[PDB]
Design a protein around this motif. Structure first.
Motif, PDB file in Angstrom:
ATOM      1  N   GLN D  15       0.891  -1.359  -0.156  1.00  0.00           N
ATOM      2  CA  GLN D  15       0.010  -0.101  -0.003  1.00  0.00           C
ATOM      3  C   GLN D  15       0.783   1.241   0.077  1.00  0.00           C
ATOM      4  O   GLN D  15       1.762   1.496   0.357  1.00  0.00           O
ATOM      5  N   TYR D  30     -13.358  -3.421 -15.459  1.00  0.00           N
ATOM      6  CA  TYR D  30     -14.273  -3.447 -14.280  1.00  0.00           C
ATOM      7  C   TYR D  30     -13.813  -4.277 -13.082  1.00  0.00           C
ATOM      8  O   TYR D  30     -13.227  -5.532 -13.473  1.00  0.00           O
ATOM      9  N   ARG D  31     -14.229  -4.074 -11.918  1.00  0.00           N
ATOM     10  CA  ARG D  31     -14.136  -4.860 -10.717  1.00  0.00           C
ATOM     11  C   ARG D  31     -15.479  -5.753 -10.445  1.00  0.00           C
ATOM     12  O   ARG D  31     -16.573  -5.289 -10.634  1.00  0.00           O
ATOM     13  N   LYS D  33     -17.933  -8.048  -8.337  1.00  0.00           N
ATOM     14  CA  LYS D  33     -18.801  -7.989  -7.168  1.00  0.00           C
ATOM     15  C   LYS D  33     -19.293  -6.329  -6.835  1.00  0.00           C
ATOM     16  O   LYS D  33     -20.267  -5.983  -7.472  1.00  0.00           O
ATOM     17  N   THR D  35     -18.613  -2.219  -7.537  1.00  0.00           N
ATOM     18  CA  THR D  35     -17.777  -1.286  -8.487  1.00  0.00           C
ATOM     19  C   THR D  35     -16.401  -0.399  -7.966  1.00  0.00           C
ATOM     20  O   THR D  35     -16.336  -0.196  -6.803  1.00  0.00           O
ATOM     21  N   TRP D  59      -6.347   0.340  -0.270  1.00  0.00           N
ATOM     22  CA  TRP D  59      -7.257  -0.890  -0.054  1.00  0.00           C
ATOM     23  C   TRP D  59      -8.315  -0.657  -1.158  1.00  0.00           C
ATOM     24  O   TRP D  59      -9.244  -2.048  -1.297  1.00  0.00           O
ATOM     25  N   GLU D  60      -8.898   0.344  -1.765  1.00  0.00           N
ATOM     26  CA  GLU D  60     -10.079   0.479  -2.236  1.00  0.00           C
ATOM     27  C   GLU D  60      -9.684  -0.026  -3.707  1.00  0.00           C
ATOM     28  O   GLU D  60     -10.669   0.158  -4.635  1.00  0.00           O
ATOM     29  N   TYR D  68     -12.475  -6.056 -20.992  1.00  0.00           N
ATOM     30  CA  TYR D  68     -12.806  -6.531 -22.449  1.00  0.00           C
ATOM     31  C   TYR D  68     -12.930  -5.107 -23.172  1.00  0.00           C
ATOM     32  O   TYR D  68     -12.718  -4.230 -22.570  1.00  0.00           O
ATOM     33  N   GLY D  70     -15.459  -3.782 -26.866  1.00  0.00           N
ATOM     34  CA  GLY D  70     -16.269  -4.151 -27.699  1.00  0.00           C
ATOM     35  C   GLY D  70     -17.598  -3.911 -27.026  1.00  0.00           C
ATOM     36  O   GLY D  70     -17.845  -4.740 -26.059  1.00  0.00           O
ATOM     37  N   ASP D  72     -21.730  -4.515 -26.586  1.00  0.00           N
ATOM     38  CA  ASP D  72     -22.669  -5.504 -27.173  1.00  0.00           C
ATOM     39  C   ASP D  72     -23.204  -5.111 -28.554  1.00  0.00           C
ATOM     40  O   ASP D  72     -23.251  -5.903 -29.483  1.00  0.00           O
ATOM     41  N   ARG D  76     -18.443  -7.322 -29.221  1.00  0.00           N
ATOM     42  CA  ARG D  76     -17.903  -7.411 -27.747  1.00  0.00           C
ATOM     43  C   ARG D  76     -17.030  -8.839 -27.580  1.00  0.00           C
ATOM     44  O   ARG D  76     -17.534  -9.932 -27.768  1.00  0.00           O
ATOM     45  N   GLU D 172      -6.847  -7.919   0.627  1.00  0.00           N
ATOM     46  CA  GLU D 172      -6.269  -6.852   1.696  1.00  0.00           C
ATOM     47  C   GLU D 172      -5.328  -7.872   2.739  1.00  0.00           C
ATOM     48  O   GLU D 172      -6.176  -8.498   3.471  1.00  0.00           O
TER      49      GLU D 172
END
Lengths: 99, 9, 276, 186
Positions: D15, D30-31, D33, D35, D59-60, D68, D70, D72, D76, D172
């Motif tokens: 960290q 993207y993450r 679970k 956002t 930690w965020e 990815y 493209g 839809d 995509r 973490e």
């Protein structure tokens, strides 16, 4: 044995920019009882922040609610800064309008 | 209401 | 329905920095009503609920004398306990004590309890029968013997079945407006895209009392217990509580999902459709 | 047409330290679970390039990330393999030790034991000199994990650090334990 605190930053009432609220920071499930909790307005520390009385859960771990009154804004970043014996250095949790 | 002082451990 | 009164004592040593820090706190159900703090300049057992402020000075005078005495026994305990486990003089240690009573719907005595803990772990506990102890660890058996010899369990039982219950009933009457009334949860659902094929549905419950609650997600009537994220039920600060439950849903299927709230404030269990 | 997702310098970062997540194959990212806001601030001069930098990691940023290109709507790519961005140094370090001893005979086996004074249920052992194994407590809630390494050799070096973590935040980690060196003797 020690326990690291769980932080939750939220508001008392649903956030509405104009209207007044309370900014909450709920630290819980930790041990020992000594803990530093600050409320941050745009990175700077908020003066005169109150807290609940020290109590504990069935597992013996502690919980505290730190709070101040505030006015939300699309133009101010609020957060909670927690530091404990279990944390190597302070940890900062941003206030998300909805967690 | 509190109980009365309890014995040492 | 059922009710409870509980006291939570917490003492913590301050090596080289003077006398230990004692904090006592009193609850009826999920509502605090008193507290004492050794660091507070007050030096008095203070009220933290309206319905207790009406108690006379004899109550405040007496309660204070008693809470002070409580702290002083725990102060010694910190010393004895360090000896029992033979630790150094550097390093802070913690003693905690939780006791109180439960009453049924009929307000008659249901259960009593009394637990002690050193540095976060169970130390000794009074059993269900209020007659015998549970000396979890070795050193705890020393204490157990003292407390058997001084018939501690008998005077505790006396308190737990006697004044504890009687004063809980009294408190419930004085605080009828606060303690016997429920706040039904205010509910709503929020939506957040995780990706373009996944979205989060979050179910909210706000402004509810008591803190006991269940939020579950369902896809086509079937429970989704495994993919649901709950947060620790948290205090609003105004004496009500908050909790939310969330699931990850495939984009364009949110309509299949429902949220189920359970709480005493609700006459019947609410079912919330994402898409009515 | 599957894209690829990796991290520089590594996927396990202390960290404060910098890191850049990279995608190769009009990108996104993207993450899983929850956002990750940090992503939707990276400027396009880069977004188009296929690179997402983080100047100072907190930690965020920790989590499971897919990538990815493209939309839809006309095109995509399938999502990439997941990357687990790990932030270390959040919690006080555990202690590592060798049962019965850090000295071992060439070809013998030893037990490494990671002990955390903070209550945790996740434990990582990392061979140094960097890949890691996963574990969890052997008692109800001991805050201790056991690892068997070996057979050992006086040629290659046998160095380890361990981490503790909460299973509900498996990205973490604690500070690492001090380096534990096995003294192997041919």
């Amino acid at each position: 044995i020690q326990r690291t605190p769980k932080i939750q930053v939220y508001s008392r009432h649903p956030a509405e920019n104009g209207k007044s609220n309370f900014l909450n920071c709920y630290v819980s499930g930790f041990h020992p009882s000594d803990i530093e909790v600050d409320l941050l307005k745009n990175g700077e520390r908020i003066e005169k922040v109150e807290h609940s009385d020290l109590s504990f859960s069935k597992d013996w771990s502690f919980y505290l609610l730190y709070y101040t009154e505030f006015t939300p804004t699309e133009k101010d970043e609020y957060a909670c800064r927690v530091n404990h014996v279990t944390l190597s250095q302070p940890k900062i949790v941003k206030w998300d309008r909805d967690m | 209401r509190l109980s009365s002082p309890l014995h040492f451990v | 329905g059922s009710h409870s009164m509980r006291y939570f004592f917490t003492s913590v040593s301050r090596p080289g920095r003077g006398e230990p820090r004692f904090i006592a706190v009193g609850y009826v159900d999920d509502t605090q009503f008193v507290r004492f703090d050794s660091d507070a300049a007050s030096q008095r057992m203070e009220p933290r609920a309206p319905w207790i402020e009406q108690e006379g000075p004899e109550y405040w005078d007496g309660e204070t004398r008693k809470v002070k005495a409580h702290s002083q026994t725990h102060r010694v305990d910190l010393g004895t306990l360090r000896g029992y486990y033979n630790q150094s003089e550097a390093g802070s240690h913690t003693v905690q004590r939780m006791y109180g009573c439960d009453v049924g719907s009929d307000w008659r005595f249901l259960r009593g309890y009394h637990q002690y803990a050193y540095d976060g772990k169970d130390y000794i506990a009074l059993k269900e029968d209020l007659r015998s102890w549970t000396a979890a660890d070795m050193a705890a058996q020393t204490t157990k013997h003292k407390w058997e010899a001084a018939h501690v369990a008998e005077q505790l039982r006396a308190y737990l079945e006697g004044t504890c219950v009687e004063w809980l009933r009294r408190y419930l009457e004085n605080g009828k407006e606060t303690l016997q009334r429920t706040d039904a949860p205010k509910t709503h659902m929020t939506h957040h895209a995780v990706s373009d094929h996944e979205a989060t549905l979050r179910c909210w419950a706000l402004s509810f009392y008591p803190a006991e609650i269940t939020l579950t997600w369902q896809r086509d009537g079937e429970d989704q217990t495994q993919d649901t994220e709950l947060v620790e039920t948290r205090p609003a600060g105004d004496g009500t509580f908050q909790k939310w439950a969330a699931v990850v849903v495939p984009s364009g299927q949110e309509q299949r999902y429902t949220c189920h709230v359970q709480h005493e404030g609700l006459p019947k269990p609410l079912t919330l459709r994402w898409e009515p | 047409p599957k894209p690829t997702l990796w991290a520089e310098p590594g996927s396990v970062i202390t960290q404060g330290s910098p890191v850049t997540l990279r995608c190769q194959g009009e990108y996104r990212l993207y993450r899983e679970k929850k956002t990750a806001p940090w992503i939707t601030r990276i400027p396009q001069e880069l977004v188009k390039k296929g690179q997402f930098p983080i100047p100072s990691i907190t930690w965020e940023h920790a989590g499971r990330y897919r990538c990815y290109y493209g939309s839809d709507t006309a095109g995509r790519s399938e999502s990439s393999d997941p990357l687990e961005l790990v932030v270390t140094g959040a919690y006080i370090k555990p202690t590592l030790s060798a049962q019965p001893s850090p000295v071992v005979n060439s070809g013998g086996n030893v037990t490494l034991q990671c002990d955390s004074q903070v209550a945790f249920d996740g434990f990582i052992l990392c061979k140094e000199g960097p890949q890691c194994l996963n574990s969890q407590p052997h008692a109800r809630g001991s805050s201790r994990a056991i690892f068997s390494v070996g057979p050992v050799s006086p040629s290659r070096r046998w160095w380890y650090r361990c981490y503790a973590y909460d299973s509900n935040s498996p990205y973490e980690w604690s500070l690492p334990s001090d380096l534990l060196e096995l003294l192997v003797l041919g």
